[PDB]
Symmetry: C5
């Protein structure tokens, strides 16, 4: 519970570097990074999305050098990987007008990443409490009408990949003391992706007392969502498209009592 | 007269809570939504029903009993459930043949305040002939001048689910003991832009280093988070709101 | 004016707090804060807007406590647009955006402007179309020529009267106004969304690069504003400007001059 | 030049204040500030714009008080687009946005540019379409080849004449202009809304990383501008560029050199 | 082992150049444009022609022959010919009856890098069954995983007119000796926003005060400036690119 001094010297720092692949639904063997085409329910009550149509949170647990000392995460560099793929406007999309190029990926996006010393803590909130979330996903159980705004029963850990749908979970702001998270939802069928890349930007993960996430059990938890928008097919059907996210985290050894 | 800050383990406290949105809640299935919006045929016949009108949210939070007063110093705040807006499959209006449903979008109002007493309101109406319904508190004796400024319309945000958003704003002539922040983004097609993080803190101290001072040991939190409108298959539209998280740090302050 | 030292002590500071109502045209007894429906001229040459169709600059001259050499110096401003949430009334004789939808909200061209000075705001006249006939009861650029469409230095005036100076044919004169601080944004386009921020935590400092604010000649403070938020479209499709009031709070201190 | 110390004393500073009028084409005696209606050629090969359809760079060479070794050094700039509120004239024979609506406001592609230098702005020619035939009375890239569509180093010029250098075929040469500070933004798209800010509280410092402003050769200051605000759409749907004048205020100090 | 910077005469140098865009150049009159964009008949049959594919630009600049190494410290950069997008009078598609031509708009990628060796690339494809054309260098043995991340796709940007923009990005796992900056703005109607000035400088030093160190006395500059698409009268669309200016200041640094 008590945080003491940082250890210095040769052995005292380490670095984690990896990428998290997006989990958009992957409806067949050719469509890694895409969801199933989105269909609309016949009535509000009958909302019942298939699993392959639901983007999910990505998570990786990274083992750290075995070490009371704990690894403290201090800085992060992060980047969406493959932003230029959205320039492919020639692959059986929907022409914007007669003889025009294909409509590029656009519309509702969620870009989110977190670094923590334990699993990201989630709070469940649903657009429509009568939505039936599908077998194979982990979703708010015993949803009530109050779950449309806040039901404190819906607590969970982001402890599994391809499992927690993006639309029914958010980071729990009442918890997550040992995690730093950042996200933006940009909503609207025509919103343009705006994706920046650079290897010169660093986020500092230290809190107001100068303490970063402390890695319980010598594990680092990285989480992400990068739903870039929707690809529209020639027919007008639409699929979520996601991209991978790069993480580089620097850690240092911190003594605790 | 504000004197010194108390120190010691006993001298700080924290409030953590959420305010649910008050969008109208037209039936047992529609918490967080308004009634579908209908348009009056004339200004004179504008008479919105209560469940069609988003209202201000407010909570009065009792603090440990204490001349000392609790002083609100910092705020962390967050809109809860931003990702619900990715549900584009729930009997909405397809954007084009075979496409996904139109997402929630259009006019938004995102607002929050922290004070040591009720938020002070000034009434202003789009149309003075609008008749606000029973069960709401609204500018009384509205005149055509109420469309721009009528100083008679003063109130306190002292009741949840009662003060309609569209006819009240924070009174800039008062609110010395409150800090408030809001943004109205208009237009039927404006995209929600909702940021979340647990790394952002707002300092509530004024230019003299003094934060809101909690009269009778009560903290007042207020919010509006109308995110936009949901469009049904039929084309009818309902406001959709989300809850707001507040975490406030307070310290004891001696006053004269 | 040679500016010398600031006075201190309890008597040395004062504060002005008020609001300026918008002057959008007010075409009937039910339409305060709106203009008349906008009509388009048959030809460029025949442009001839009626008074109730033209938003005008707002101005207030606030007398300050008498001093006399001392002048009141305006140091800080807090300001806010009043009634931003009125724009959420999309249920009141508007035009549905699509079948069964809500009304189109106020949107399109906006001008948000405010100034604080120790004398009247100085104006330069510029016209979109020099053959526009501005109406009786307004004060407009006189003897307009084709050069008035870009810059004609004859068109100088003072913002010295309310409901009088149309917004479209006057701007702050950047060649003058040394004793005023002004700020404005024109956001064009027929569909631009209003973005209106409110807070009581923001202050603007009015001091120039030498540490001197507007000095109030004859102990009067001049506040000016325009807050055209956009156009309201009614059910027939006709459009009217909609404006809102602006709050001002200004802190002043006594400054000796020679 | 070796740059040495700045002179002090009352005589050591001077100010320049002026405005540059826009040069949009001026197709007739009533249309100062506008271009001719814009037409579209059938092929790249057949592109042949009329002179009065082409906006041009504006330039003023301002003589300064005679010095001779001392040179005037430009230190600060205040600048403002003049007449931003003219864009609120949406009643002057424009095209209704929809039935009973107000006229479509000026919008679409804009270029806002200004520069301050101690010699003429240096230009590099680049063309959208090398087969464009530029008209008599303009100065344009000569001997254009297909490489001129991306970069042909033959097209060097000085902005040394008003109403002459079309905006679309010239830019500031980033390989030169050491003795000039320039700033510009092109915002494209047929529906981009103008966003025009005005204030008299904003100053740009013109000093480089070594603390040295433009040094005025022969005691002349060179000011250049373009303010294409967008296009005006007439009732018929024809479109014309609309520009506005730009105010400059420059502070200069005396600098010794060798 | 990076040691001290040399000072004095001949201890600094400057590189100035421009990189032309490589958009495909489909004929002798269309330098700076791509071929008209065609849409494949099926997802599987995606097979873009070379002249339809913008590529990364690169230049290797020899430095004064020099252990000392040239260290890149600052960059000034600018897109050249921004005003060409005001040509809305040639061979375009009127935005409405009697209107000017639709200007260049839609998807853009603006990117630049400075390094002391070739930019390192990671391949990522929109569609793994896309057949990239002869004469381009593209991710080989692409699998479905290549749609998100296949670590087999590594390359150096070591050739002009060869690496298509759409299937390569800077590799964030490498490039320790390069500084790179890019923005993808997607959507068919996005307006170009192009700023020019000679007053902005980017500093190339890392968190330790060390800039790119130029191996073999070569400086590597890379760029893409796809500004958007030009629409012809027929509605067919072509990518349009512009050149990029670079000015880099370098100093001599001793190393062990
Ligand atoms: C290849 C294709 O996209 N086929 C479409 C088909 O397209 C034809 C149609 O537009 C006709 C109309 O005239 O024109 C044909 O092309 C002609 C061309 O215009 C003409 O100039 C030339 O001379 O001749 C040709 C003749 O061939 C078009 O080929 O339209 C139908 C009806 O809209 C589509 O059927 C629907 O298929 C659905 C599943 O298929 C897709 C899809 O959703 O569209 C195909 C996508 O390519 C695929 N995308 C990806 C990234 O994999 C998606 C995706 O796998 C899933 O959605 C994932 O969930 O599948 C679905 O079965 C629906 O029920 C059918 O109506 C047909 O696809
Ligand atoms: C379920 C639904 O949305 N029903 C609509 C109905 O929809 C039918 C219509 O689009 C026809 C058109 O051909 O097609 C039917 O579907 C067919 C499908 O296209 C075809 O491919 C397939 O093979 O066959 C089916 C046949 O079923 C559609 O089902 O349209 C009517 C007329 O527009 C709607 O009537 C209006 O209902 C209003 C109240 O209902 C709603 C609403 O406002 O739209 C339903 C919303 O789902 C509900 N939303 C939520 C979040 O709860 C709202 C909401 O509760 C309130 O608005 C809150 O105030 O209510 C209203 O009664 C109005 O007067 C009716 O005209 C019908 O809803
Ligand atoms: C007064 C007017 O705008 N007349 C245009 C005419 O309008 C008709 C309207 O008066 C009547 O009520 O309804 C009918 C429909 O039944 C019409 O809408 O419509 C004509 C056909 O489109 C136009 O003819 C064109 O005129 C051009 C030159 O005139 C204009 C122009 O539109 O380009 C008139 C503009 O007011 C003027 N604008 C300014 C700011 O001066 C421009 C401008 O001077 C030039 O464009 C500068 O280059 O000129 C051409 O002659 C064109 O060929 C012709 O079809 C009537 O103009
Ligand atoms: K269900
Ligand atoms: K009524
Ligand atoms: K007239
Ligand atoms: K030609
Ligand atoms: K293929």
């Amino acid at each position: 519970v008590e945080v003491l001094e940082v250890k210095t010297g040769v052995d005292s720092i380490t670095e984690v570097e990896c990428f998290l692949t997006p989990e958009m639904g992957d409806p067949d063997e050719h469509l890694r990074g895409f969801s199933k085409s989105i269909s609309i329910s016949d009535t509000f009550e009958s909302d019942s999305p298939n699993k392959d149509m639901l983007p999910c949170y990505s998570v990786a647990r990274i083992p750290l050098p075995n070490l009371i000392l704990m690894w403290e995460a201090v800085t992060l560099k992060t980047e969406v990987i493959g932003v230029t793929t959205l320039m492919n406007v020639h692959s059986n999309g929907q022409a914007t007008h007669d003889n025009g190029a294909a409509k590029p990926v656009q519309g509702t996006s969620f870009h989110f990443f977190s670094v923590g010393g334990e699993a990201l803590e989630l709070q469940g909130v649903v657009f429509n409490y009568r939505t039936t979330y599908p077998d194979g996903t982990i979703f708010p159980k015993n949803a009530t009408v109050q779950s449309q705004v806040m039901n404190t029963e819906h607590k969970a850990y982001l402890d599994k990949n391809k499992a927690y749908p993006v639309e029914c979970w958010v980071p729990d702001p009442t918890r997550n003391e040992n995690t730093r998270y950042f996200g933006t939802l940009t909503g609207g069928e025509n919103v343009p992706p705006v994706l920046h890349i650079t290897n010169t930007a660093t986020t500092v993960l230290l809190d107001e007392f100068g303490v970063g996430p402390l890695c319980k059990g010598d594990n680092l938890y990285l989480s992400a969502v990068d739903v870039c928008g929707m690809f529209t097919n020639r027919s007008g059907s639409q699929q979520w498209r996601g991209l991978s996210r790069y993480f580089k985290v620097q850690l240092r050894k911190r003594r605790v009592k």
